[PDB]
Amino acid sequence: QSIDQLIKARGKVYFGVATDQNRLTTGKNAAIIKADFGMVWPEESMQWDATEPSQGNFNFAGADYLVNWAQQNGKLIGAGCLVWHNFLPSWVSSITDKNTLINVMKNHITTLMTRYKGKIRTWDVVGEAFNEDGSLRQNVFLNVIGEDYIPIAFQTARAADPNAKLYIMDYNLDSASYPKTQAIVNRVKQWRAAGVPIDGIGSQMHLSAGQGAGVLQALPLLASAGTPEVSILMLDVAGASPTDYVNVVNACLNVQSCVGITVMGVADPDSAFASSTPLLFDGNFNPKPAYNAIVQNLQ
């Protein structure tokens, strides 16, 4: 039973999964993604250090492979992250001149999005921009450009591909009482009021056991920012309890603007957190109790 087909039947857009050429060419990953998922999300091949390892010298081979595989198999594509502090080459973080960095950032955004224009459903434009107390995270963009780097990034992305949905994303947005959750809602409200084209908030749900229950209140709070969409991505759950996974799915179903869920890989041994067995398929590529519980809940 395909959880993507079942979640579409309930009115959502997709159940997706993070992957890349390394996974699609080994084991049973390709067969499972074909059968059970409706959207793919490159784990590393679209990040800055992979795509622009030297300034103006782009490398698209891995990203091209993923996009072509998705189109051939009828899958939606989400891609990112265009601007964040992870996967960032030193040549970028060493820039100290504001105009130089604005132009570098705009060029990185425009080049990636133009190459795949019309083919990408969702771009993660800005990621992990907030500290745990709700202040903005001090990365090179904030240090050199200032808080305007976020509006500039989204305005540039919107001009490059008006078809794509443009997201901001962060982690630890899983509790409605946590300062970070309330801060991103307030800031996104203000940005949208100023005309900034933020289409979505993506919640990076790398969850500890038992945190699914709190998502039932956190996700509606994120939806109150008034973006056209919200999504769940990078989802995994330590221990992979059915209770946590079903709670996360029910939160999605309860929030009308939540378009879908993307899990953080297929099989446990390929997770960065493999020792906590946090995914929906085990090391033999067999569906786990959590997978069957999602199927049963959606039916």
Numbering used by the authors: 4 to 302
Which statements did the authors publish about this structure?
HG3.17 was evolved from HG3, a higher-activity mutant (S265T) of the in silico design HG2 that was engineered post-design to reduce the active-site conformational heterogeneity observed by molecular dynamics analysis of HG25. Over an evolutionary trajectory that yielded the HG3.3b, HG3.7, and HG3.14 intermediates, a total of 17 mutations were introduced into HG3 to produce HG3.17, resulting in a catalytic efficiency increase of approximately three orders of magnitude.
All unit cells corresponded to space group P212121 with two protein molecules in the asymmetric unit, except that of HG3.17, whose asymmetric unit was half the volume of the others and contained only one polypeptide chain although the space group was also P212121. In contrast with all other HG variants, the unbound state of HG3.17 is correctly pre-organized for catalysis in a large portion of the molecules in the crystal, with only Trp44 adopting a non-productive conformation at 62% occupancy. In this variant, Met237 adopts exclusively the productive conformer in the unbound state, which is stabilized by packing interactions with the neighboring Met267 side chain, a mutation that was introduced late in the evolutionary trajectory (HG3.14 to HG3.17).
